[PDB]
């Protein structure tokens, strides 16, 4: 008993406003937005250049055409390290954001994120016991505090747990079980609440490879799976060339270069996306388990100039359209990764300072990709 029980006021099970199964819940969602670099930012909510989440932002997200938000959250840095007690002020701040998103009729998914790495980088036997205890303490607290929200609120137990092999996968399964058990033991609406569980590294391939069973649940048909998508790295996030490969500036049929052809994709084009998303359709969607596509986006390269810029941006725009559209086609619910930035190598499509659209052309792609 490393930490005290934070399961202090467990309520009676309450199905009020928790009527939708995972699958029904998932039919209500077709486009999602991440509040990236915000509630997970190390040093505080405003420490990574974004301002505090405001109702105005959430209204803009719903106005702009999204159905749900994913709110990565940091926790470890706000908790007493001897007792694993999380600051009541932080807890009230998270509740406040959840309440506002739901006031804007958004679905909401709250996680524990990388969060300084305590769990996410430590899916190993040596850390399993201490991590299991912290996972339980935090989740008891988190779910207790958020217990009364109806089915607009989902929980996701981890972010991108670094499980690379079967041994690490079994540790990750443990972490997911504790997350389920923690949440359910607090009762109330948390007995029926749709929970979201993460594939190893949220990587499609390693999930297909290593995943086995959902954790056991007292609830019935109340679990989703989660993967992320930044394929191919070279286009989506690569910022410099390495010896092993070059950055892709361009992507998609119609938008490849003929002058600088070395910045066209050598891989990770349309068919591959089709193929990976098919792996998850088979493993989960067709077994009646929706898949959250929790993060995707390809960064802007505004350090380009000229014909180069114009081409890049056309390809970037289509990539988001294609991923949005092909994920939906196969039962994956796509959530755009937005780190708030409007500068180079960033992914913000809103201007957080002004509560306005910065990147209409990418917002258009996600929308056309959902609206079709
Ligand atoms: O200090 C934190 C610590 O973080 C460690 O990396 C881990 C951490 O990444 C944060 C980055 O997350 C990106 O999103 C990821 C998402 O969370 C994952 O789920 C997804 O799989 O992968 C995504 C990868 O893309 C997010 O897009 C990144 O922005 C973020 O990086 C942090 O960004 C902030 C904000 O500014 C930058 O982005 C916005 C731009 O407009 C701007 O131009 C950029 O500079 C950075 O803030 C800065 O902090 C430095 C510190 O000195 C100051 O110099 C600067 O003034 C201040 O603005 C921040 O540094 C950067 O970390 O969480 C996800 C995990 O996967 C990563 O491993 C690093 O290893 C540590 O070294 C350390 O930074
Ligand atoms: Cl390809």
Q: How far is CA 370 from CA 22, 28, 254, 322, 334, in A?
A: 20, 13, 21, 10, 9
**Unique residue bearing structure tokens 């609830």:** 219
> What is the C-alpha separation between 74 and 72, in angstroms, rounded?
7
3-class state of residue 332 by DSSP:
strand
Q: Reduce the secondary structure of 67-112 to three states and give it as a string.
A: CEEEECCCCHHHECCCCCCECHHHHHHHHHHHHHHHHCCCEEEEEC
> What is the C-alpha separation between 231 and 296, in angstroms, rounded?
9
| CA nearest ligand 1 atom 26, residue | 339
> What is the C-alpha separation between 236 and 247, in angstroms, rounded?
9
φ, ψ of residue 83 in degrees (nearest 5): -115, -15
Catalytic residue among 45, 151, 160, 269: 160
| Residue 295 Cβ < 6 Å to ligand 1 | yes
User: 277 has which bridge partners?
Assistant: none
Cβ(348)–Cβ(299) below 8 Å:
no
Instruction: For the chain, give the number of residues.
Output: 372
Cβ-in-10-Å burial (0-12, 13-18, 19+) of 209 comes to middle
| CA nearest ligand 1 atom 50, residue | 48
The angle at the Cα of 233, spanning 230 to 238, to the nearest 5 degrees, equals 120
HSE of 17 in the Cβ direction (CA atoms, 13 Å)?
11
**Residue closest to 39 by CA, chosen among 142, 181, 144, 177:** 142
Q: What is the DSSP letter of 37?
A: T
| Ligand minimally distant from the alpha carbon of residue 114 | 1
Is 160 annotated as catalytic? Answer: yes
Q: Residue 153: which residues within 8 A CB-CB, separation 6 or more? A: 98, 102, 107, 108, 109, 110, 146, 193
Catalytic residue among 40, 140, 226, 295: 295
User: Can you list the positions of beta strands (E) in the chain?
Assistant: 32-34, 68-71, 107-111, 153-156, 195-198, 223-229, 291-296, 332-336, 350-351, 356-357
Cβ-in-10-Å burial (0-12, 13-18, 19+) of 286 comes to exposed
HSE of 321 in the Cβ direction (CA atoms, 13 Å)?
17
Cβ(79)–Cβ(124) below 8 Å:
no
Cβ(146)–Cβ(94) below 8 Å:
yes
End-to-end CA distance of the chain: 53
Q: How far is CA 202 from CA 208, 211, 273, in A?
A: 11, 11, 15
Cβ count near 87 (within 10 Å):
13
| Ligand minimally distant from the alpha carbon of residue 271 | 2
> What is the C-alpha separation between 131 and 121, in angstroms, rounded?
11
Q: Which of 40, 49, 303 to probe ligand 1 with, by most ligand atoms within 8 A of CB?
A: 49
Is 164 annotated as catalytic? Answer: no
| Residue 116 Cβ < 6 Å to ligand 1 | no
Look up residue 7 and give its two tokens.
């399961």
> What is the C-alpha separation between 76 and 141, in angstroms, rounded?
12
Measured from the Cα of 43, ligand 1's closest atom is: 1
Look up residue 279 and give its two tokens.
């792996």
Cβ(328)–Cβ(368) below 8 Å:
no
> What is the C-alpha separation between 331 and 314, in angstroms, rounded?
26
Beta 332-336 vs 291-296: how paired, if at all? parallel
| Residue 228 Cβ < 6 Å to ligand 1 | yes
| Cα torsion through 367, 228, 44, 182, rounded to 10 | 120
**Residue closest to 78 by CA, chosen among 31, 38, 44:** 44
| Ligand minimally distant from the alpha carbon of residue 265 | 2
> What is the C-alpha separation between 85 and 235, in angstroms, rounded?
41
Cβ-in-10-Å burial (0-12, 13-18, 19+) of 277 comes to buried
| Residue 234 Cβ < 6 Å to ligand 1 | no
| Residue 44 Cβ < 6 Å to ligand 1 | no
Look up residue 247 and give its two tokens.
């950055």
> What is the C-alpha separation between 217 and 111, in angstroms, rounded?
18
> What is the C-alpha separation between 326 and 315, in angstroms, rounded?
16
| Residue 114 Cβ < 6 Å to ligand 1 | yes
Q: Residue 2: which residues within 8 A CB-CB, separation 6 or more? A: 84, 130, 133, 134
**For residue 232, is the peptide bond before it cis, meaning its omega torsion is within 30 degrees of 0?**
yes
Domains, the chain: 1-372 (3.20.20.80)
| CA nearest ligand 1 atom 41, residue | 341
Beta 356-357 vs 350-351: how paired, if at all? antiparallel
| Residue 339 Cβ < 6 Å to ligand 1 | yes
Please, what's the largest Cα pairwise distance for the chain? 67
φ, ψ of residue 356 in degrees (nearest 5): -125, 165
**Residue closest to 361 by CA, chosen among 255, 232, 234, 260:** 255
> What is the C-alpha separation between 75 and 121, in angstroms, rounded?
15
Long-range contacts of 350-354 (CB under 8 A, 24+ apart): 350/57, 350/60, 350/61, 350/64, 352/50, 352/51, 352/57, 353/51
Q: How far is the CA of 114 from the centre of ligand 1 (A)?
A: 11
| CA nearest ligand 1 atom 25, residue | 237
User: 107 has which bridge partners?
Assistant: 68
> What is the C-alpha separation between 39 and 25, in angstroms, rounded?
24
> What is the C-alpha separation between 44 and 58, in angstroms, rounded?
19
> What is the C-alpha separation between 104 and 36, in angstroms, rounded?
18
């Amino acid at each position: 008993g490393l930490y005290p029980s934070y399961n202090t006021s467990p309520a009676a099970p309450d199905s009020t406003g928790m009527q939708s199964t995972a699958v029904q819940l998932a039919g209500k969602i077709r486009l999602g937005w991440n509040i990236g670099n915000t509630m997970e930012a190390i040093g505080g909510e405003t420490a990574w250049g974004n301002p505090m989440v405001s109702n105005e932002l959430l209204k803009l997200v719903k106005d702009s055409g999204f159905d749900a938000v994913r709110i990565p959250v940091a926790w470890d840095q706000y908790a007493n390290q001897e007792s694993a007690e999380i600051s009541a002020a932080w807890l009230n701040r998270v509740k406040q954001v959840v309440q506002m998103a739901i006031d804007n009729e958004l679905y909401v998914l709250i996680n524990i994120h990388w969060d300084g790495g305590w769990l996410e980088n430590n899916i190993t036997p040596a850390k399993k016991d201490e991590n299991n205890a912290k996972q339980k303490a935090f989740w008891e607290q988190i779910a207790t505090h958020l217990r009364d929200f109806d089915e607009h609120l989902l929980f996701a137990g981890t972010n991108e747990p670094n499980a690379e092999n079967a041994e690490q996968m079994d540790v990750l399964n443990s972490y997911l079980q504790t997350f389920v058990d923690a949440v359910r033991s607090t009762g109330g609406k948390n007995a029926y609440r749709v929970l979201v569980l993460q594939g190893p590294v949220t990587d499609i391939e390693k999930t297909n490879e290593l995943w086995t069973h959902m954790p056991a649940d007292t609830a019935t048909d109340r679990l989703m799976a989660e993967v992320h998508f930044y394929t191919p790295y070279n286009f989506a996030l690569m910022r410099q060339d390495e010896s092993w490969g070059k950055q892709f500036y361009y992507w998609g049929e119609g938008f490849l270069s003929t002058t600088d052809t070395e910045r066209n994709p050598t891989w990770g084009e349309e068919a591959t996306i089709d193929q990976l998303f098919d792996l998850m359709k088979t493993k989960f969607v067709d077994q009646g388990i929706p898949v959250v596509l929790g993060e995707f986006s390809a960064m802007r390269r505004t350090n380009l100039t000229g014909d180069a810029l114009t081409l890049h941006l056309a390809g970037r725009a289509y990539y988001h359209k294609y991923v949005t559209q092909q994920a939906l086609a196969r039962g994956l619910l796509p959530f755009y990764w937005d780190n708030g930035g409007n500068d180079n190598f960033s992914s913000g499509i809103f201007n957080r300072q002004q509560n306005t659209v910065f990147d209409q052309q990418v917002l258009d792609a996600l929308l056309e990709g959902a609206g079709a």
